[PDB]
Amino acid sequence: TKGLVLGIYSKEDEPQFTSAGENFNKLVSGKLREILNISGPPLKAGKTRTFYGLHEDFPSVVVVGLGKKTAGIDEQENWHEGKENIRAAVAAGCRQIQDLEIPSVEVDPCGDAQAAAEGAVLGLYEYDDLKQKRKVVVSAKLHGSEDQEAWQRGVLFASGQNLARRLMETPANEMTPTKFAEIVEENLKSASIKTDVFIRPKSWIEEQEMGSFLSVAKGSEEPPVFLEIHYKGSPNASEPPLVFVGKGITFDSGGISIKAAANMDLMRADMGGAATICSAIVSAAKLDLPINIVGLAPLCENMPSGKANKPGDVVRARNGKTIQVDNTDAEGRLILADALCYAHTFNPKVIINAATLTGAMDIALGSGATGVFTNSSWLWNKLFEASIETGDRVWRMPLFEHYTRQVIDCQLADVNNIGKYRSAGACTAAAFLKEFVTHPKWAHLDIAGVMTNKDEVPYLRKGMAGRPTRTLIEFLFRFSQ
Amino acid sequence: QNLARRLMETPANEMTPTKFAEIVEENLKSASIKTDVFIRPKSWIEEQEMGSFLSVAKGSEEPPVFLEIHYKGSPNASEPPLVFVGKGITFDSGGISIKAAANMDLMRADMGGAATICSAIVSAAKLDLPINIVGLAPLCENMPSGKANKPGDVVRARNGKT
Amino acid sequence: TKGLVLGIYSKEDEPQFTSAGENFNKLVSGKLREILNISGPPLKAGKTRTFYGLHEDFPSVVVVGLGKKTAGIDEQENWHEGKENIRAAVAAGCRQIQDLEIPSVEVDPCGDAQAAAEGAVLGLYEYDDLKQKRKVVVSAKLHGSEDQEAWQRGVLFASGQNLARRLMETPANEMTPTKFAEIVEENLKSASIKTDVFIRPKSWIEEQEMGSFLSVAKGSEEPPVFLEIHYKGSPNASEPPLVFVGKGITFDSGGISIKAAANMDLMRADMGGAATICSAIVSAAKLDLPINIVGLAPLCENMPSGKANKPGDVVRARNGKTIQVDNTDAEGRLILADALCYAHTFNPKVIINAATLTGAMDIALGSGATGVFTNSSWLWNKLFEASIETGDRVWRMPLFEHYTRQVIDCQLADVNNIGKYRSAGACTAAAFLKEFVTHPKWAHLDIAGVMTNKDEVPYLRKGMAGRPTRTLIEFLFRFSQ
Ligand SMILES: [Zn+2]
Ligand SMILES: [Zn+2]
Ligand SMILES: [Zn+2]
Ligand SMILES: [Zn+2]
């Protein structure tokens, strides 16, 4: 009927199976173990082998490599390695059932039903929607009935990611400042009726003295929308919130300080900051987490025109500070100078903000870890531990005065959107945003190196990554618990 | 000088083709009541067959203003003048033949020509110098857009030359 | 006769003095306190004011701002801030005595006689030697007689730095692979007779199957020298050592994969890795630290010629691994593939290596902190704590498999001197070097962002920085103790 992803570890006396496959072997009377011997060398990590006709109702059975049974937290990779073995491994497996065009598949729990589900679901995702030429659409259910809410936690966590991924990936002519707001509101509302959405327009933004956000919007003839998300998780609604903030440029052409044509099509995912955090709130509502969260996202586009933002311009942020706009591509910093100010209105506990802010971050760590600068070691630890579980690493970076200094000197104004020099790129951009924040537990996450995947993360196919949505969701689960 | 300097230095979103004209007129008028100002608009410019000036203005959605300054310094007003002229791009991005981002913020001072000479007339009025001077300055911006000036284009200057 | 740098803090009832200046006030009978009132607003951090004729033997008296008395370790700047106040502050002071052309100056201990001496000495340094037009040469002694071995520890620590600085700064036609070896040997030998030097030549290198180091040397007609330093610090000479390794390109032109002319004159300090660590061993010998240290440094130049290293070339490192040399500017990685292998010969405890390795590090942190990747959290902590004392910060970076992977795939060979992509620049370069190391406590310090100073570090004038020589020296003091 349908396919099966089964698993095996690496040697003891005979390389063992995850019990479900030990059990499926008994079932086809040793003929799985036996054909695996006949096939060739053993299956190391995330390597795959397909065995036809072993079972009457499982014509294709893919056995995938899970590595060492007792693989655990790694001091060097700063993750739980087991989970990582299982994700790459059942992603691998699920992508094999899928090339065989088997529309459904049952997955071996592999000792961690959540890693299995985060592998099967992140593993299989594409964004097929505008290609009339699509791969088969395969339904992936758990094999078994024992470990069900952890597999659904995998499906949940990986699905919150695939949403950031679709929200990122879609061409920015479809994915506008209005359409993103609309899908996020429909997604947050299906998640919890204990929610409110506000797709606030230019009049409200104008009214909110958001000059910096608004200066950025004006080049395009596409409407700005400041989005406001509310999740009423706590028992007493009056609990102070945890506010997520995120930059939402639907398309970044650089503006007058215009980008080069080389691969500029990826700028459609410069709204990755707004996508990431939104998908993460949708998931804590889906999880129905005992915390009140607020989601904030400036949405607009960065375009050249007869009325675009010019180099040398002093605009005013909500908080009275003026910014010299010396480079029109440094606009996420400006979009975020106002949504960050508005975050203090809400009286929060933690203000996590996220943004595909600078390529220098990409030069720095470049898809290994997502750089997070925070004036809070508590907050750092909190993020870093979630990174170990989820596997979507996060690395700390310096919010030293050293850097505020280069952005704080300014010919016309109070702050300047770029620093005096080329060096320390992600650090000057983060020390510019510190100027718009006075809350003690603040964290900037620069998502610009983890924007994309190719081969680096296994269980993620080539394209927009939606990183770090699960670390973020894992942080709010641990914080709620 | 410090007036040309402030008139140069101010970010070109504040220092427009209209705001420069306005500060220069207030400065020239405080200097001497023996003055006249004309912050002539696009209709006058159109009328003055200023196709070349006007082609430049069209990329931006910011208004052109041709500024005209008069200082009546001489005893006999009929003395022929000394005319100062000066380029007043409030911001230069290069247009379609667009500049590189490296330090382009300084293009706010591409109206330095109009600033320099204006500040100089304001001072000869402040000095109340026995000469009639006339100040002339095209003000506009150079921007890329759906209706910006394209490469290869023949426009016509007031004098018939293309 | 001579000048005086005195100090004052920020308000209580009347902004207090460092006791020496309270004492110098009593001495000119309140007329220092009194003229400070008459002068204007109070002196905040590292700001300066000169008072002539207060004393008969102190014609110019500079009072410098020390900030808050109780300024201490900062959780955000990750340093001892007091020390930092005092360095910038008596550097400031000493540079004022010096423009007045007063050839000598007495310095206020300022509560930490070492920070005062590290400020006066780093503060005043230039490299005047090839200018017939030089500033005055001012002798800076302590004011007082109470706290003498800590001031001499400042003078020692700052002088080990100014040596890395002179060793960096000198034009690479003077500072050759032979001349560096010669000054280091004269400096290490004046420091301790319990030392040995080996300025090993091309024949020895050839003999040591150092194909990678040697491939790099061949473009130039300037001799390679592999330098070997020995400090016999321990009681039992048989104690295993702590081996420092460091890249010593006297000049880097990129080779065939040739650099652009823009500011290429700074490549004379691509031997900053060899300078840094050498200056640090010279200082632990000067300190006579109860540890055996070994200093290792490939010295050579990177030049284009009829026999330079070409793009696409497989050369062999001492350890059997082959490297595809796809970019001739990635040569520090190659120079270090062999000196790192040779480090395991010595049976070490810690292998600290240091190198002006990549500009991407400069894009990353860029003179804030010196990036240190280490497979040793112990080693990381050890370095990071020294950074807090000295003020010369050090930031951890990721030695994740993620990065080994991009350098480990290779068309012709085993490893490749550059990675498949532009991203994660310092991380691929550090994960390439991990391939030449099998010791548990290894640490790569990429010095390329801290190569230079301008205004960022106060007590250091514009030019080669000699960073992090004091963090390094402080680590060996703490390790010996
Ligand atoms: Zn941009
Ligand atoms: Zn952007
Ligand atoms: Zn190089
Ligand atoms: Zn080099």
Side-chain angles (χ1 to χ4, degrees), chain C residues 72-112:
Chain C
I73 287 86
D74 197 322
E75 285 91 301
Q76 295 340 290
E77 295 312 319
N78 299 156
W79 56 20
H80 186 116
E81 178 197 23
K83 291 171 162 283
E84 275 289 337
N85 291 305
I86 297 151
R87 295 185 180 108
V90 336
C94 293
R95 282 191 286 249
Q96 172 62 83
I97 292 293
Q98 193 194 230
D99 183 30
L100 272 165
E101 303 170 20
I102 298 153
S104 232
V105 64
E106 268 195 53
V107 175
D108 186 344
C110 289
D112 193 295

Short mmCIF file of all heavy atoms in Angstrom, two decimals, chain C residues 72-112:
data_model
loop_
_atom_site.label_atom_id
_atom_site.label_comp_id
_atom_site.label_asym_id
_atom_site.label_seq_id
_atom_site.Cartn_x
_atom_site.Cartn_y
_atom_site.Cartn_z
N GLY C 72 34.41 48.51 38.11
CA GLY C 72 35.01 47.18 38.22
C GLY C 72 34.72 46.34 37.00
O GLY C 72 34.48 46.89 35.93
N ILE C 73 34.76 45.00 37.13
CA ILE C 73 34.38 44.08 36.06
C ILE C 73 32.98 44.50 35.59
O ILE C 73 32.10 44.84 36.39
CB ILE C 73 34.35 42.55 36.56
CG1 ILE C 73 35.74 41.93 36.79
CG2 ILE C 73 33.66 41.70 35.50
CD1 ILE C 73 36.35 42.20 38.20
N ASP C 74 32.84 44.52 34.27
CA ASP C 74 31.64 44.90 33.55
C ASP C 74 31.01 43.64 32.97
O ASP C 74 31.75 42.98 32.25
CB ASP C 74 32.13 45.85 32.53
CG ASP C 74 31.11 46.74 31.85
OD1 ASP C 74 30.02 46.26 31.59
OD2 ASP C 74 31.45 47.89 31.57
N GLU C 75 29.75 43.22 33.20
CA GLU C 75 29.19 42.03 32.56
C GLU C 75 29.01 42.18 31.06
O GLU C 75 28.92 41.19 30.31
CB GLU C 75 27.79 41.60 32.99
CG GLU C 75 27.62 40.94 34.32
CD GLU C 75 27.33 41.89 35.48
OE1 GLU C 75 28.14 42.80 35.74
OE2 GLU C 75 26.29 41.72 36.12
N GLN C 76 28.91 43.41 30.58
CA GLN C 76 28.72 43.58 29.16
C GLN C 76 30.03 43.79 28.45
O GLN C 76 30.20 43.17 27.40
CB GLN C 76 27.76 44.75 28.87
CG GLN C 76 26.29 44.60 29.36
CD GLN C 76 25.74 43.20 29.67
OE1 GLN C 76 25.50 42.33 28.79
NE2 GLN C 76 25.52 42.98 30.97
N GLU C 77 31.00 44.55 28.98
CA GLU C 77 32.20 44.77 28.20
C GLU C 77 33.25 43.69 28.36
O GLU C 77 34.19 43.57 27.56
CB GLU C 77 32.83 46.12 28.54
CG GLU C 77 32.09 47.43 28.21
CD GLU C 77 31.52 47.53 26.78
OE1 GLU C 77 32.17 47.12 25.83
OE2 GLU C 77 30.40 48.03 26.59
N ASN C 78 33.00 42.85 29.39
CA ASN C 78 33.85 41.70 29.68
C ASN C 78 35.30 42.08 29.86
O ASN C 78 36.23 41.60 29.19
CB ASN C 78 33.83 40.67 28.58
CG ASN C 78 32.52 40.03 28.23
OD1 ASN C 78 32.35 39.56 27.11
ND2 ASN C 78 31.59 40.00 29.19
N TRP C 79 35.40 43.07 30.74
CA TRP C 79 36.71 43.49 31.15
C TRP C 79 36.65 44.10 32.51
O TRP C 79 35.58 44.26 33.09
CB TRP C 79 37.30 44.48 30.15
CG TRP C 79 36.49 45.73 29.84
CD1 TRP C 79 35.50 46.25 30.63
CD2 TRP C 79 36.79 46.52 28.80
NE1 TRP C 79 35.19 47.40 30.09
CE2 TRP C 79 35.96 47.59 28.99
CE3 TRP C 79 37.57 46.42 27.69
CZ2 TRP C 79 35.93 48.62 28.08
CZ3 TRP C 79 37.50 47.40 26.75
CH2 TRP C 79 36.71 48.50 26.95
N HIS C 80 37.82 44.43 33.02
CA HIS C 80 37.84 45.17 34.24
C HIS C 80 37.84 46.54 33.64
O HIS C 80 38.73 46.88 32.85
CB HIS C 80 39.09 44.95 34.97
CG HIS C 80 39.00 45.63 36.31
ND1 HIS C 80 39.04 44.94 37.44
CD2 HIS C 80 38.96 46.97 36.59
CE1 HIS C 80 39.04 45.83 38.40
NE2 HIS C 80 38.99 47.04 37.88
N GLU C 81 36.84 47.31 34.00
CA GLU C 81 36.73 48.64 33.45
C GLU C 81 37.70 49.66 34.09
O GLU C 81 38.19 50.55 33.38
CB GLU C 81 35.26 49.04 33.61
CG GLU C 81 34.95 50.44 33.12
CD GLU C 81 33.64 51.08 33.58
OE1 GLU C 81 33.05 50.71 34.61
OE2 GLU C 81 33.20 51.99 32.88
N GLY C 82 37.99 49.53 35.41
CA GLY C 82 38.87 50.44 36.13
C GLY C 82 40.22 50.59 35.44
O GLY C 82 40.63 51.67 35.02
N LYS C 83 40.89 49.45 35.30
CA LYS C 83 42.14 49.30 34.59
C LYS C 83 42.15 50.00 33.24
O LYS C 83 43.12 50.70 32.88
CB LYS C 83 42.39 47.83 34.42
CG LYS C 83 42.68 47.19 35.77
CD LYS C 83 42.74 45.68 35.71
CE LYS C 83 43.45 45.14 36.94
NZ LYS C 83 44.89 45.29 36.83
N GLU C 84 41.01 49.82 32.53
CA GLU C 84 40.77 50.44 31.24
C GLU C 84 40.64 51.94 31.35
O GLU C 84 41.06 52.66 30.46
CB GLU C 84 39.51 49.93 30.59
CG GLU C 84 39.69 48.66 29.83
CD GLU C 84 40.48 48.79 28.54
OE1 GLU C 84 40.57 49.88 27.95
OE2 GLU C 84 41.00 47.77 28.12
N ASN C 85 40.06 52.41 32.46
CA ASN C 85 39.96 53.83 32.66
C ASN C 85 41.35 54.41 32.84
O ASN C 85 41.75 55.29 32.09
CB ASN C 85 39.10 54.13 33.88
CG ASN C 85 37.64 53.78 33.64
OD1 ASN C 85 37.00 54.23 32.70
ND2 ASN C 85 37.08 52.96 34.52
N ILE C 86 42.10 53.76 33.72
CA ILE C 86 43.45 54.18 34.04
C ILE C 86 44.39 54.14 32.85
O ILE C 86 45.21 55.05 32.76
CB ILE C 86 43.92 53.27 35.21
CG1 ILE C 86 43.01 53.54 36.43
CG2 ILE C 86 45.41 53.53 35.55
CD1 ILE C 86 42.85 52.33 37.38
N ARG C 87 44.30 53.16 31.91
CA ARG C 87 45.20 53.06 30.75
C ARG C 87 44.98 54.21 29.79
O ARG C 87 45.89 54.93 29.41
CB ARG C 87 44.99 51.75 29.94
CG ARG C 87 45.31 50.48 30.67
CD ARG C 87 45.24 49.18 29.89
NE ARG C 87 45.59 48.08 30.77
CZ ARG C 87 44.69 47.19 31.22
NH1 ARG C 87 43.43 47.14 30.82
NH2 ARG C 87 45.09 46.28 32.09
N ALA C 88 43.73 54.42 29.41
CA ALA C 88 43.38 55.49 28.50
C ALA C 88 43.69 56.84 29.12
O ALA C 88 44.10 57.78 28.45
CB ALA C 88 41.90 55.42 28.19
N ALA C 89 43.51 56.89 30.45
CA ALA C 89 43.68 58.11 31.18
C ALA C 89 45.14 58.46 31.37
O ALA C 89 45.40 59.62 31.07
CB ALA C 89 43.01 57.98 32.53
N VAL C 90 46.10 57.58 31.77
CA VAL C 90 47.48 58.04 31.93
C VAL C 90 48.16 57.97 30.56
O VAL C 90 49.23 58.57 30.40
CB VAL C 90 48.38 57.24 33.03
CG1 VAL C 90 47.53 56.57 34.10
CG2 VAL C 90 49.23 56.21 32.39
N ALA C 91 47.59 57.32 29.53
CA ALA C 91 48.15 57.39 28.18
C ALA C 91 47.99 58.79 27.65
O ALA C 91 48.94 59.36 27.12
CB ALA C 91 47.43 56.54 27.16
N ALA C 92 46.77 59.30 27.91
CA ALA C 92 46.30 60.64 27.56
C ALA C 92 47.19 61.72 28.14
O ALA C 92 47.60 62.64 27.42
CB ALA C 92 44.92 60.84 28.11
N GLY C 93 47.46 61.48 29.44
CA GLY C 93 48.27 62.32 30.29
C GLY C 93 49.68 62.33 29.80
O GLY C 93 50.20 63.41 29.56
N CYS C 94 50.28 61.15 29.62
CA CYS C 94 51.63 60.99 29.08
C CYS C 94 51.88 61.55 27.66
O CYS C 94 52.97 61.99 27.31
CB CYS C 94 51.99 59.52 29.10
SG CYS C 94 52.17 58.77 30.75
N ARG C 95 50.85 61.54 26.82
CA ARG C 95 50.92 62.10 25.48
C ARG C 95 50.87 63.62 25.45
O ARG C 95 51.18 64.23 24.42
CB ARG C 95 49.75 61.56 24.62
CG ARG C 95 49.97 60.14 24.09
CD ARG C 95 48.93 59.74 23.03
NE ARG C 95 47.62 59.44 23.58
CZ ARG C 95 47.08 58.20 23.62
NH1 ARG C 95 47.63 57.11 23.07
NH2 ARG C 95 45.91 58.06 24.24
N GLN C 96 50.42 64.21 26.58
CA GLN C 96 50.37 65.66 26.82
C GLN C 96 51.71 66.19 27.36
O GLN C 96 52.18 67.25 26.95
CB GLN C 96 49.25 65.93 27.80
CG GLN C 96 49.17 67.35 28.32
CD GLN C 96 48.92 68.39 27.23
OE1 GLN C 96 47.78 68.62 26.82
NE2 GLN C 96 49.94 69.07 26.71
N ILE C 97 52.31 65.46 28.34
CA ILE C 97 53.67 65.73 28.81
C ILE C 97 54.57 65.70 27.57
O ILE C 97 55.21 66.72 27.29
CB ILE C 97 54.06 64.64 29.84
CG1 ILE C 97 53.22 64.78 31.09
CG2 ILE C 97 55.51 64.78 30.22
CD1 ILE C 97 53.52 66.07 31.90
N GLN C 98 54.52 64.60 26.78
CA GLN C 98 55.23 64.48 25.52
C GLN C 98 54.97 65.55 24.44
O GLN C 98 55.94 65.85 23.73
CB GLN C 98 54.94 63.14 24.87
CG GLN C 98 55.92 62.90 23.72
CD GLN C 98 55.53 61.78 22.78
OE1 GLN C 98 56.33 60.87 22.45
NE2 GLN C 98 54.26 61.89 22.35
N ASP C 99 53.78 66.16 24.19
CA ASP C 99 53.69 67.21 23.18
C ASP C 99 54.36 68.42 23.81
O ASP C 99 54.96 69.22 23.09
CB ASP C 99 52.21 67.60 22.74
CG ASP C 99 51.97 68.68 21.62
OD1 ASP C 99 52.76 68.87 20.67
OD2 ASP C 99 50.95 69.37 21.58
N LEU C 100 54.36 68.58 25.13
CA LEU C 100 55.07 69.70 25.70
C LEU C 100 56.57 69.57 25.61
O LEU C 100 57.29 70.52 25.87
CB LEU C 100 54.61 69.90 27.14
CG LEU C 100 53.36 70.81 27.22
CD1 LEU C 100 52.76 70.66 28.61
CD2 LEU C 100 53.72 72.29 26.85
N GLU C 101 57.03 68.40 25.14
CA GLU C 101 58.42 68.07 24.92
C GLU C 101 59.21 68.00 26.22
O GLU C 101 60.36 68.44 26.28
CB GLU C 101 59.10 69.08 24.02
CG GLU C 101 58.53 69.33 22.64
CD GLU C 101 59.15 70.54 21.94
OE1 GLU C 101 60.25 70.99 22.29
OE2 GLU C 101 58.50 71.04 21.02
N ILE C 102 58.55 67.46 27.26
CA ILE C 102 59.17 67.25 28.56
C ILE C 102 59.70 65.83 28.48
O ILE C 102 58.93 64.88 28.33
CB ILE C 102 58.13 67.36 29.69
CG1 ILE C 102 57.47 68.74 29.77
CG2 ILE C 102 58.85 67.12 31.00
CD1 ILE C 102 56.06 68.61 30.40
N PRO C 103 61.02 65.64 28.54
CA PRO C 103 61.66 64.36 28.27
C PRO C 103 61.48 63.29 29.32
O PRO C 103 61.90 62.15 29.08
CB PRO C 103 63.11 64.73 28.04
CG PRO C 103 63.29 65.87 28.99
CD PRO C 103 62.03 66.67 28.72
N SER C 104 60.89 63.65 30.46
CA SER C 104 60.70 62.69 31.53
C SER C 104 59.33 62.94 32.17
O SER C 104 58.78 63.99 31.94
CB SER C 104 61.85 62.87 32.56
OG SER C 104 62.58 61.69 32.92
N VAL C 105 58.74 62.02 32.93
CA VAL C 105 57.43 62.21 33.54
C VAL C 105 57.34 61.11 34.56
O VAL C 105 57.89 60.03 34.38
CB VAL C 105 56.14 62.08 32.54
CG1 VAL C 105 55.95 60.71 31.93
CG2 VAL C 105 54.85 62.29 33.31
N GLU C 106 56.70 61.57 35.64
CA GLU C 106 56.33 60.82 36.81
C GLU C 106 54.85 60.58 36.77
O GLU C 106 54.09 61.52 36.62
CB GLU C 106 56.65 61.59 38.02
CG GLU C 106 58.03 61.19 38.42
CD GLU C 106 58.30 61.65 39.82
OE1 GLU C 106 57.50 61.32 40.69
OE2 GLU C 106 59.30 62.32 40.05
N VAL C 107 54.46 59.31 36.92
CA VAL C 107 53.05 58.90 36.77
C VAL C 107 52.35 58.50 38.09
O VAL C 107 52.91 57.77 38.89
CB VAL C 107 52.98 57.70 35.70
CG1 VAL C 107 51.54 57.15 35.61
CG2 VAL C 107 53.51 58.18 34.32
N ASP C 108 51.12 58.97 38.31
CA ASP C 108 50.32 58.68 39.50
C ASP C 108 49.97 57.22 39.45
O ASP C 108 49.37 56.86 38.43
CB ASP C 108 49.05 59.53 39.45
CG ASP C 108 48.10 59.52 40.64
OD1 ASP C 108 48.18 58.64 41.49
OD2 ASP C 108 47.26 60.42 40.71
N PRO C 109 50.24 56.35 40.45
CA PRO C 109 49.89 54.93 40.41
C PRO C 109 48.43 54.64 40.04
O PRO C 109 48.12 53.62 39.43
CB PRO C 109 50.28 54.42 41.78
CG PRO C 109 50.42 55.65 42.65
CD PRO C 109 50.98 56.66 41.67
N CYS C 110 47.53 55.59 40.35
CA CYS C 110 46.10 55.60 40.05
C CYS C 110 45.23 54.47 40.58
O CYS C 110 44.09 54.24 40.15
CB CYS C 110 45.95 55.74 38.55
SG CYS C 110 46.40 57.40 38.03
N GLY C 111 45.80 53.84 41.61
CA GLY C 111 45.17 52.75 42.33
C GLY C 111 45.55 51.36 41.82
O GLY C 111 45.32 50.36 42.52
N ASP C 112 46.14 51.29 40.62
CA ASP C 112 46.55 50.02 40.05
C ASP C 112 47.87 50.31 39.37
O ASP C 112 47.84 50.61 38.19
CB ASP C 112 45.48 49.58 39.05
CG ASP C 112 45.64 48.14 38.62
OD1 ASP C 112 46.62 47.78 37.97
OD2 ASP C 112 44.75 47.36 38.94
#
